[PDB]
Structure formats: structure tokens, C-alpha cells
Amino acid sequence: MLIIGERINGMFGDIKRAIQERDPAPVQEWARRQEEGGARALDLNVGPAVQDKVSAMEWLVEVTQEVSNLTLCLDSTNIKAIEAGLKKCKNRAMINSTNAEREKVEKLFPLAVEHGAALIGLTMNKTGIPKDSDTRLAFAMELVAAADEFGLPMEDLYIDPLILPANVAQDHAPEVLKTLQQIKMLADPAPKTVLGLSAVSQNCQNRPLINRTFLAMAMACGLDAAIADACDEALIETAATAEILLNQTVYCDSFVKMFKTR
Amino acid sequence: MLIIGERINGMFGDIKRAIQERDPAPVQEWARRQEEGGARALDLNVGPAVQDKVSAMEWLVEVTQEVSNLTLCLDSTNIKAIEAGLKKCKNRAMINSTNAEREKVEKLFPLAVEHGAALIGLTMNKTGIPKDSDTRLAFAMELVAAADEFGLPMEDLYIDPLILPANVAQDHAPEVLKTLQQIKMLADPAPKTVLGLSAVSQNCQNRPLINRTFLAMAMACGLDAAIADACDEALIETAATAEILLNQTVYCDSFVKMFKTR
Ligand SMILES: CN1c2c(nc(N)[nH]c2=O)NC[C@@H]1CNc1ccc(C(=O)N[C@@H](CCC(=O)O)C(=O)O)cc1
Numbered sequence: 001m002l003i004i005g006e007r008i009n010g011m012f013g014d015i016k017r018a019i020q021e022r023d024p025a026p027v028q029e030w031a032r033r034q035e036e037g038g039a040r041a042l043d044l045n046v047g048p049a050v051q052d053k054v055s056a057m058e059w060l061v062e063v064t065q066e067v068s069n070l071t072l073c074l075d076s077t078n079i080k081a082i083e084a085g086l087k088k089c090k091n092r093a094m095i096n097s098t099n100a101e102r103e104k105v106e107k108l109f110p111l112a113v114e115h116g117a118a119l120i121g122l123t124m125n126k127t128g129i130p131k132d133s134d135t136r137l138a139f140a141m142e143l144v145a146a147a148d149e150f151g152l153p154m155e156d157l158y159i160d161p162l163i164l165p166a167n168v169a170q171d172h173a174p175e176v177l178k179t180l181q182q183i184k185m186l187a188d189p190a191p192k193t194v195l196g197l198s199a200v201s202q203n204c205q206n207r208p209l210i211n212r213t214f215l216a217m218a219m220a221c222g223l224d225a226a227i228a229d230a231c232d233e234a235l236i237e238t239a240a241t242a243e244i245l246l247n248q249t250v251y252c253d254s255f256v257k258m259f260k261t262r
Numbered sequence: 263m264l265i266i267g268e269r270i271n272g273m274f275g276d277i278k279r280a281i282q283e284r285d286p287a288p289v290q291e292w293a294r295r296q297e298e299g300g301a302r303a304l305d306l307n308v309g310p311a312v313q314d315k316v317s318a319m320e321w322l323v324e325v326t327q328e329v330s331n332l333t334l335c336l337d338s339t340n341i342k343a344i345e346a347g348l349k350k351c352k353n354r355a356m357i358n359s360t361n362a363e364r365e366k367v368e369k370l371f372p373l374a375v376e377h378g379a380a381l382i383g384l385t386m387n388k389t390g391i392p393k394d395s396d397t398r399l400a401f402a403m404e405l406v407a408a409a410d411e412f413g414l415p416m417e418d419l420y421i422d423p424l425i426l427p428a429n430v431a432q433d434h435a436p437e438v439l440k441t442l443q444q445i446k447m448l449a450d451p452a453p454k455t456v457l458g459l460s461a462v463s464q465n466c467q468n469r470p471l472i473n474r475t476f477l478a479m480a481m482a483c484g485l486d487a488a489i490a491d492a493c494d495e496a497l498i499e500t501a502a503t504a505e506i507l508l509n510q511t512v513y514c515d516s517f518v519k520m521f522k523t524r
Pocket residue numbers: 006007009011012013045075096097120160162163194195196197198199202203227
């Protein structure tokens with residue numbers, strides 16, 4: 001399980017201000033803390049508030065790699081900002097993301113290959129986020145074929161079925177688990193899977209509990225990565241424990257510690 | 263998710279003495295505590311220490327139903343003990359258990375049917391516990407066929423893949439999840455599944471964490487019931503959260519309390 005730190009996101013007040021005032025301190029501190037928690041990748045989202053998003057992404061990249069060697073997950077719907085971020089990246093990167101829309105596929109897949117970066121693909125297109133697992137799977141397969149079409153190693157493709165809040169979109173959770181399981185059954189080399197975990201508990205009571213529980217469930221269905229709260233110790237425990245229960249990581253009494261220091 | 267209180271088991275020192283001394287207090291207290299925790303079924307195991315296991319099982323049934331209306335899960339390898347127990351039960355019972363051995367099947371399935379009781383079936387026989395999910399599933403299918411043969415409603419059949427410690431039999435864990443998953447399919451009306459959860463963390467560190475992490479993972483694979491620590495609040499939280507994430511129970515802010523007071 002690859003935990004992709006979610007905190008460096010412009011939606012958060014302290015990050016929005018840091019980006020605006022170009023104050024590296026807050027961002028660099030969240031990079032450190034998240035890595036200390038066990039994250040091995042860092043999601044970098046400038047947010048919708050900042051004016052120049054291209055320049056902002058570049059900045060987030062430069063200030064972050066100054067204090068971290070972790071993989072940078074460039075999170076933005078602005079492809080120009082993504083490209084700009086990649087050109088500044090000193091370490092392996094992740095593109096977050098592309099969807100099944102053909103127009104975006106032919107821009108992001110080649111872009112991912114050009115930079116040897118990982119690519120996150122959402123199971124959806126202009127038509128919207130499908131509920132039924134069969135439809136989500138269909139989009140996933142289109143992404144799979146795309147990885148082969150453009151020469152992207154299947155292992156660098158992370159398919160995201162898009163989890164939603166369990167209190168107002170509850171019927172989506174099981175459809176997500178089913179999609180992940182179907183994707184897990186694909187032949188070698190099979191693609192990977194990811195999820196913006198925290199969305200499952202939006203507006204719910206005891207979000208950490210919901211987050212933990214779903215992470216464990218998702219991992220049982222093949223989940224390989226999760227953009228989530230790397231500073232949530234209980235969550236990190238689950239990640240570590242889940243790997244053990246899937247026999248992905250050999251057991252030892254300090255399995256939690258080993259996960260955070262590997 | 264049906265939590266079957268595991269605590270009234272002769273292997274525990276206090277229960278062993280209570281049975282040997284015929285002191286109802288310890289047993290009745292544990293019965294009430296487990297129900298309050300959220301259990302809706304109580305496992306009753308006289309343990310190996312007591313000499314007369316048939317009258318010990320009758321006693322457990324007597325002192326327990328005296329204070330509890332909960333379904334009683336008669337846990338014994340001695341069929342005479344199970345029979346004597348069933349005859350003492352005033353409420354519907356559960357039989358734990360029968361394995362896939364034909365000789366055992368033709369005695370227990372008819373016994374469960376006669377008493378209108380639930381029956382637990384272990385995916386194993388005289389050759390032992392199969393590690394590979396293929397063989398676990400093979401025995402699971404025999405049990406399903408036997409239920410049809412003897413007239414046991416498929417919903418009263420709980421198949422147990424038999425989980426083992428994650429520190430010495432770690433490769434069994436993923437096989438158990440796969441088996442549960444394949445069982446979840448088969449054909450409607452599909453049978454139910456159960457597990458002696460606590461075995462997964464035996465002799466491990468951070469046992470509660472390992473238990474609840476696996477419970478969640480198991481539930482995503484269709485687990486229906488679990489013999490476990492109904493007095494472990496964190497375990498109960500996981501069960502309640504898992505039902506929500508599978509859309510088996512409608513979300514509401516106090517879903518945990520609702521699960522417990524259900
Ligand atoms: C849509 N999510 C997502 C993605 N990328 C992919 N590939 N998939 C996804 O599902 N990128 C962004 C987001 C994941 N990150 C996050 C980050 C924070 C919160 C969150 O819980 N935010 C708080 C904000 C609190 C504040 O404003 O101070 C919230 O309550 O909404 C959720 C998901």
C-alpha cells in the first residue's frame with residue numbers, strides 16, 4: 001500500500017495562503033510530517049483559488065522537493081500546470097490525472113510516458129461518474145488499452161474508480177469495491193488501483209473510522225495506493241496491517257514501524 | 263454482520279472454574295456484557311478441562327438463557343453434548359459445528375434440521391485444513407450440497423473457511439478471503455459465512471488491530487457472522503462501519519450505537 005499524502009492541497013486554508021503569499025514553510029512542514037507518518041508519495045494540488053495555477057504547481061514542486069525525495073503526485077485538471085510541474089520535477093512523478101475522455105487520453109498518456117511518470121486514470125468521461133461497477137470497469141479497460149496503445153507500462157497505470165461520500169452516495173461504495181476486484185483479476189501485467197480515500201467519509205461522523213474501514217476493505221480488493229491522511233496514525237496502522245493480512249509483507253511484531261520506515 | 267460472543271469458552275480460566283464449580287455468576291455476567299457490547303448470539307464452549315462435557319453444556323445453556331434471550335451457539339466436538347444442549351434450549355440455537363466429513367454431515371445436518379437450528383460448517387475433513395482456496399471451496403460446496411440434500415435452509419448454513427494466526431500461517435489469510443469471495447457467489451439463495459476471528463491474531467502483537475482489520479476485509483468478501491470479542495468496542499465499530507460501506511445498513515450519524523442497540 002502506497003499512501004499518497006493528501007494535505008498539500010490548496011483547498012486547505014493554510015496551503016491556499018502559503019501558495020498565495022509564496023510562503024514555503026507551511027508546505028515544507030506538511031511534506032515532512034506526512035513523510036514521517038509513512039507516506040511515500042505527496043499529492044500536490046494548488047486549489048481553485050490561486051490565480052496563476054501553472055506557476056503555482058511549479059512552485060509547489062520546487063519547494064517540496066527541496067525538503068523531500070518522495071514521489072510527487074501532480075494533482076490538477078490543468079494539463080499545462082501538470083506539464084510545467086513535470087519539467088520542474090527532480091524525482092519520479094505521478095500524474096493526477098486523466099479520465100476516459102479520448103481528448104485527455106492522447107495528451108496525458110504520451111505525457112506520462114515522455115516523463116516516465118505514473119498515471120492515474122479515473123473511470124469516467126464527460127458523461128459523468130457511473131454508479132454500476134460494470135460501467136466503471138468498461139472505462140477502466142479503455143484506460144488499460146490506452147496504456148498499451150501509447151506504450152505506458154501497465155504497472156505505471158493507477159486506475160481510480162472514484163469513491164464518494166458514504167452518507168449521500170452510499171450505494172457507490174460496494175460498486176467501487178466490485179470494480180477494484182474486477183480490475184484485480186486482470187492478467188499480468190495488471191494495472192494498479194488508487195482512490196481519494198477521504199471522500200468516502202465527507203460530512204460523516206467519525207471520518208477516521210470510516211476511512212480506515214474502507215481502506216482495509218479496498219485493499220482486500222486489490223487497492224495499491226490511496227491519496228489519504230498520512231498523518232492519521234490509526235489509518236497508517238490499517239495500511240500496514242492490511243498488507244500483512246494479504247501476505248504482501250511478511251509479519252513481524254513491529255510491522256507497523258517497519259511500514260513507516262521502509 | 264452477526265457478532266457471536268466468543269467469551270463463554272472453557273478455555274478461559276474464569277469460565278473453566280465457573281463450569282467446574284457450577285457457579286452461574288461468571289457466565290451470566292459475561293452473557294450480559296457481550297449482549298450490551300452488541301452480540302446477538304453467544305458461543306457456548308465447555309472447554310476440554312471438565313470431565314462430563316454433556317452435562318456441562320446443558321448447564322451453560324441453562325444458566326445462560328436464564329438471563330439472555332440471545333441465540334445460543336453450541337460449540338462442541340461431542341455430538342451428544344450438542345444434542346443435550348439443543349434439547350435444553352428454549353430459543354432457536356446454532357450448531358458449531360460439522361466439517362465436510364460425510365459421517366459428520368449425515369448426523370449434524372439432520373440434527374440441525376430437526377431442531378430448526380442454524381448449522382456452522384468448517385471447510386475441512388479428515389485430511390485436515392486445506393490451505394489452497396480451491397480445496398476450501400471444494401469442501402464449502404459439499405456443505406452447500408448437503409444442506410440441499412437434508413433440507414436445511416441455505417440461510418441457516420454458515421460456512422467457516424477456518425482462519426489461522428497471521429504470524430505463523432500468514433499465507434492462509436489471503437486464501438480465506440478468496441474462499442469467502444467465491445462462496446459469496448455460488449448461487450442464490452446463497453449460504454452464509456462465519457469465522458472464529460480471534461484466531462487470526464493469536465500470539466501476535468497488536469491483536470485488536472489485526473482482528474478488526476481482518477473483519478473489515480472479510481466483510482467485503484461477504485462475511486456474515488463472526489465469533490469474536492463482542493466486548494471489544496473497536497471491533498464492534500468496525501463491524502458497524504463495514505455494513506455501511508457495503509450498503510447493507512443505511513447510514514445515519516449514530517450508526518455504531520444503532521448497530522449495538524439493534
Ligand atoms: C477528489 N479526490 C481525488 C484526487 N485524485 C484522485 N485521483 N482521486 C480522488 O478521488 N485528488 C483530490 C481528492 C483527494 N484529496 C482529498 C483531500 C482532502 C479531503 C478532505 O477531507 N478535505 C476537507 C477540507 C477541510 C478544510 O477545508 O480545511 C473536507 O472536509 O472536505 C478529501 C480528499
